[PDB]
Amino acid sequence: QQYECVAEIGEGAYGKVFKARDLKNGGRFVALKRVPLSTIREVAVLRHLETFEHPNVVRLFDVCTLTLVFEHVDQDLTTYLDKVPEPGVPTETIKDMMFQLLRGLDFLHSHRVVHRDLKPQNILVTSSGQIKLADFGLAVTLWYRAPEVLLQSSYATPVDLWSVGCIFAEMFRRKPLFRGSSDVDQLGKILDVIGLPGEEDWPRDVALPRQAFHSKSAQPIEKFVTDIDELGKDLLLKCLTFNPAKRISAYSALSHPYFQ
Numbered sequence: 221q222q223y224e225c226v227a228e229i230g231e232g233a234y235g236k237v238f239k240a241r242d243l244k245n246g247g248r249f250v251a252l253k254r255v256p257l258s259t260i261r262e263v264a265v266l267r268h269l270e271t272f273e274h275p276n277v278v279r280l281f282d283v284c285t286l287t288l289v290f291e292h293v294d295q296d297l298t299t300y301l302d303k304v305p306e307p308g309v310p311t312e313t314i315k316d317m318m319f320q321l322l323r324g325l326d327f328l329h330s331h332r333v334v335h336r337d338l339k340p341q342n343i344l345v346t347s348s349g350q351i352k353l354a355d356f357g358l359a360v361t362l363w364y365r366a367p368e369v370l371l372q373s374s375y376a377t378p379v380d381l382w383s384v385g386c387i388f389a390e391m392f393r394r395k396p397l398f399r400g401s402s403d404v405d406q407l408g409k410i411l412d413v414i415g416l417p418g419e420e421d422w423p424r425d426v427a428l429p430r431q432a433f434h435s436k437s438a439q440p441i442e443k444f445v446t447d448i449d450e451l452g453k454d455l456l457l458k459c460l461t462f463n464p465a466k467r468i469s470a471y472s473a474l475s476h477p478y479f480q
């Protein structure tokens with residue numbers, strides 16, 4: 221066999237993911253995920269995106285015929301944040317890591333692919349300090365979920381920029397912003413901070429009415445994220461817009477004055 225399983229990374233959600241040895245290619249570490257026609261189209265898309273070899277998405281090495289073979293990265297964002305020396309992440313490091321993130325996201329959005337579960341645990345940091353995206357394109361924590369996903373209203377690309385706002389905040393605080401035990405609790409936490417949207421912004425034909433949430437004003441963001449720039453504040457707000465339509469795009473965000 222070309223691969224020897226040595227460890228189980230974890231997840232176990234869609235399937236069991238193993239860290240192995242690529243015996244045929246110099247014993248480099250790889251990540252394996254052993255897993256109808258809707259799945260066959262899911263992998264065709266991954267193989268297709270590998271052709272452009274974007275630097276800010278994890279590399280897909282092979283598809284054995286069913287196991288998927290990715291490069292292994294030893295580290296994720298949470299572990300980087302765990303082990304970052306106090307006072308924490310230099311603001312210039314935040315800017316670049318973010319820039320790498322939106323570049324990966326724009327690449328995916330451009331080819332009409334949504335991550336749908338963008339969290340710090342499937343954001344990889346290579347030894348070279350490069351950002352790589354993982355665990356997307358194949359069908360527990362709600363802390364990074366867009367309001368539309370929670371409300372079961374829309375599941376479009378704006379969802380992934382909501383998650384980016386959440387992560388952007390977490391790079392200063394080094395603690396998650398919205399920690400909900402459930403979808404409604406999650407929704408509660410969000411509206412405590414960003415405030416109650418207008419009725420025109422609340423999607424129609426949805427279980428949860430705007431009237432299940434009370435006294436929600438609009439807390440200034442500096443209170444939750446300190447040592448944040450004016451330009452960073454501007455960008456964070458356009459990402460954490462309640463209405464997916466009024467929310468900024470990855471392409472549009474890559475041009476924001478914050479990055480200059």
Ligand SMILES: CN(C)C(=O)c1cc2cnc(N[C@H]3CC[C@H](N)CC3)nc2n1C1CCCC1
Nearest residue numbers: 237251253290291292293294295296342354355
């Ligand atoms: C479909 N798969 C398997 C991927 O997209 C993929 C390629 C990976 C390459 N390196 C890593 N590293 C892990 C990050 C977390 C930390 N414990 C160190 C191990 N995860 C990869 N992943 C998944 C596994 C779960 C998180 C994202």
